[PDB]
Amino acid sequence: FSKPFMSLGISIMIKKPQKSKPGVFSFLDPLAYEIWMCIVFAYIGVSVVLF
């Protein structure tokens, strides 16, 4: 054998994480869709009762 002309080693290969562009309505994530609708139905319900 001659002198090593290139060094190497056992490396790890994982899937490159994408940019993960958030959705247009990403701000509606902390509250579920059921909560947002129930708020609107409770909003109109309180208004009619108040009237």
H, E, C per residue of 11-51:
CCCCCCCCCCCCCCCHHHCCCCHHHHHHHHHHHHHHHHHHC
**Alpha-carbon distances of 27 from 10, 15, 37, rounded to whole Å:** 43, 28, 15
CB of 19 to ligand CCCCCCCCCC, least distance (A): 23
Site for another protein in 1-51 (CB under 8 A): 34, 38, 41-42, 44-45, 48-49, 51
Please report whether residue 40 would count as binding ligand OCT according to CB under 6 A.
Answer: yes
Nearer to another protein, 10 or 44 (CB): 44
CB of 33 to ligand XVD, least distance (A): 7
